[model samples]
Target chain A: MDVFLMIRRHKTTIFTDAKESSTVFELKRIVEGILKRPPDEQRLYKDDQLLDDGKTLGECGFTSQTARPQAPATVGLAFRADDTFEALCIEPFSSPPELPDVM
Target chain B: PVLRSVNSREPSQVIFCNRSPRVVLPVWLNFDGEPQPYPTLPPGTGRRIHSYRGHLWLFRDAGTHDGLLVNQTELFVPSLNVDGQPIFANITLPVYTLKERCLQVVRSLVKPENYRRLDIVRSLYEDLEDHPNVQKDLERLTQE
Candidate 1:
């Protein structure tokens, strides 16, 4: 069966679809299509336990029918970017002339 | 205490609080693929920096050359809009040991570049090699 998903992140709600037997990695690919973010940049969570890429949606128990019929399953996405490093300077002294005294 | 500018006119900020002693902590921020430096934070002190969303902040001790990239897993920067008010992220980084300070620095540097270059070569060649004419040409070159 086709399953609808609701993704929450940065005060935005994104809706997408997948299959009940789909793997988490497959869902990530679907999300990548919608969000323009790659699978590696996404961390998806449902009900606190971190979802594994190898697990199927049915295996992960995504079918929660508490609300109405065909309600989208909710998930949280934490997006991340690559790390970039640069050298930064600091001035410990309140005044520059007093710098020699501390050294 | 959270680091924030006294002037309310300033926009949202992300604060890094350093608690280690005698170590100058250098901060590298991800500004949409452009890395910028935040002022060196002295031990037991903190600084407020301009807030950016969905970026990673890398930290390292200042004593080493090509300082080992600390925090291998990227850390998320919280968004500026929170409950209709812009809030700040006060991130507290724990002290690093002399041992954990420099593992995989040399090892990590070599592997990623090689893999990335291989990915580039594979992507380009795969695109070209998938065509029937290009495959025939490659076969002819090998046979010759």
Candidate 2:
């Protein structure tokens, strides 16, 4: 049996099929459905490539066991910026930001 | 294969950033010590610090909303000579009430590679995450 899951973050949401064995990119396609934009318009995170409309889950190191249909992944939501569009990765070992004293 | 890049030679500092009613920057004194105001933050920015950690963890609390810092991962970099500039690692405050669960979620989501990107931090946290001092402080923070 195929199960569908919803991945939600703040203002964005997407549906994913757990049975077909999905890829990170394939999940993003479902995001396009909720966003009313094309799959190319959604951004996936921390991965090397953008998910195309037709890619499957297994290719991205995920399996149907990882998610289920009509349920939500046990995770919060956030906008994943397209890395291809990011100008730069933040410098590592940079100074920590300062905040006021708690007392 | 162990990634050689971003590994740190000395201890690295971990800091927290939150934008609640009042922005709070809590800097960890040691691995698990009480988070204190970052005395080292640079001028105009707020606070700064330089620490020698056996490891470093980089956490992004991007959507965390609770006013408490959450989710941390190790980061590594080779020897850094920042002319004494403090290193700031960011953590988002979890908005949801159940912190331990949020932490568990973060634990499952973060990759070991993400922590090692800044090598020194990886070493520090691994060696110290369970240190008596580190554990004490960590427990306090989580329980608080």
Note the DockQ of each predicted structure. 0.01, 0.03
Task: Provide the TM-score, chain A, model 2.
Answer: 0.42
- Estimate the lDDT of model 1: 0.51
Instruction: State each model's C-alpha RMSD to the native.
Output: 25.1, 19.9
Model 1 C-alpha lDDT per residue in residues B10-93, reported as the tens digit of each score: 345565565444344444433233334556766677666665454445454444312322233223344555654544433343
RMSD of candidate 1 to the truth, in angstroms, is 25.1
Task: DockQ for candidate 2, please give it.
Answer: 0.03
Candidate 1 local lDDT, residue B76? 36
Q: State residue B25's C-alpha deviation in candidate 1, in Å.
A: 76
Per-model CA lDDT versus the true structure: 0.51, 0.40
Worst 10 residues of 2 chain A by lDDT: A84-93
